[PDB]
Amino acid sequence: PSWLRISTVQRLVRQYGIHTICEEGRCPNRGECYGQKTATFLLLGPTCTRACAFCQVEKGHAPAAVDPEEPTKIAAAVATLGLRYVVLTSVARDDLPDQGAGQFVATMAAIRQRCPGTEIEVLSPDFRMDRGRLSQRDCIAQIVAAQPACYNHNLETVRRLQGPVRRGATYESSLRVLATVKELNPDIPTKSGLMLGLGETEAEIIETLKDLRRVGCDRLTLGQYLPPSLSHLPVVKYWTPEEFNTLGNIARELGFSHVRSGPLVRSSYHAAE
Ligand SMILES: CSC[C@H]1O[C@@H](n2cnc3c(N)ncnc32)[C@H](O)[C@@H]1O
Numbered sequence: 060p061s062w063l064r065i066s067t068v069q070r071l072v073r074q075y076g077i078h079t080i081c082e083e084g085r086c087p088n089r090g091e092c093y094g095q096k097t098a099t100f101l102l103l104g105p106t107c108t109r110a111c112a113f114c115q116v117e118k119g120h121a122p123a124a125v126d127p128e129e130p131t132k133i134a135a136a137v138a139t140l141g142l143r144y145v146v147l148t149s150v151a152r153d154d155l156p157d158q159g160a161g162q163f164v165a166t167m168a169a170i171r172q173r174c175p176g177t178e179i180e181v182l183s184p185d186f187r188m189d190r191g192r193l194s195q196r197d198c199i200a201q202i203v204a205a206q207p208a209c210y211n212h213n214l215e216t217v218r219r220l221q222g223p224v225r226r227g228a229t230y231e232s233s234l235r236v237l238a239t240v241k242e243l244n245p246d247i248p249t250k251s252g253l254m255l256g257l258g259e260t261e262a263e264i265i266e267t268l269k270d271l272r273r274v275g276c277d278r279l280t281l282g283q284y285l286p287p288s289l290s291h292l293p294v295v296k297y298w299t300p301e302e303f304n305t306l307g308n309i310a311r312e313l314g315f316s317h318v319r320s321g322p323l324v325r326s327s328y329h330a331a332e
C-alpha cells in the first residue's frame with residue numbers, strides 16, 4: 060500500500076536498562092513523539108506470558124522477575140530526557156497478587172518526586188485475573204488514586220474478533236475497566252483504541268464506538284493493524300486515509316474528544332494533545 064511507509068533516547072533507555080514498548084515495536088511515530096518529548100515505558104517485562112496474536116512483545120513461559128528499581132530507573136530516564144508527558148504501560152502479569160498495579164503506582168510516585176510537573180498517562184492491562192486476589196476494581200482503584208492525566212485501556216477490536224485477536228482478554232472485561240475508572244473518579248479522562256483491518260466491518264466499528272461511549276470513554280484512537288512478521292494473525296484490509304478521516308469525524312460526532320485516526324496511529328500517539 061503506497062501511503063504506508065536521533066539515538067539519544069535510544070541511548071539512554073539502553074543505558075538505564077529499562078524498556079519502552081516504543082523502541083521495541085519499532086513504532087513509526089517516534090521522532091514525531093520523541094520530538095515532542097514523549098515516550099511509552101513498558102513495566103514488568105520485557106517478556107509477557109499472554110498470547111495476543113497482534114503483539115510484538117517477546118513471549119515467555121515464565122514471568123520476568125519484578126525489578127524493584129524499575130520505578131526509579133524510569134524516573135531517572137524521564138528526568139534526563141526532559142520528557143514532558145509520559146505514558147506508562149505494562150505486560151499482563153497474571154502471576155502477581157496485585158497483577159502489577161503497584162508497579163504503576165510506584166513508578167508514578169518516582170516520576171513525580173524527581174520530575175515535578177511531568178504529566179503521566181497509564182495504558183493498563185485489564186487486571187481481570189482476579190480469582191481469590193485483590194479485585195479488578197481495586198487494581199484499577201490503586202492507579203486511579205494516583206491521578207493519572209489519562210487512563211487508557213484498549214479494546215483493540217470489535218466484539219466478534221476478540222477471540223482470535225486477544226485470546227485471553229474479553230470485550231466485557233475491557234469495557235468494564237473503562238466504566239470502573241469513571242465510577243471511581245469521573246474527572247479522570249479515559250481513552251480506548253482500536254486496530255482496524257482485522258476483518259471488522261464499518262457497521263461493527265460503529266457499534267463498538269457506541270459501546271465505548273456508553274461507558275463514558277472520552278477519547279479514541281484508530282490505527283491500522285500491521286502484522287508482526289511471524290504472526291499467524293493476517294491483515295484482511297488496509298483502511299485508506301480517507302476512511303480513517305471519516306471515522307474520525309464519526310467519532311467526534313458521537314462525542315469523543317482528542318480523537319486520533321490514521322494508519323500509523325497508536326493509542327499513545329500525540330497523547331499530550
Ligand atoms: C500504544 S502501544 C500499545 C498499543 O499499540 C497497538 N498495537 C500493538 N501492536 C500493533 C500492531 N501490530 N499494529 C497496530 N497497532 C498495534 C495496540 O492497540 C496496543 O494496545
Ligand code: SF4
Nearest residue numbers: 107109111114150151
Ligand atoms: S497482554 Fe498486552 S503486552 Fe501481553 S501480549 Fe497482550 S498486548 Fe502484548
Ligand code: SF4
Nearest residue numbers: 081086088089092327
Ligand atoms: S506512538 Fe506510542 S508507542 Fe509509538 S512512539 Fe509514540 S509513544 Fe511510542
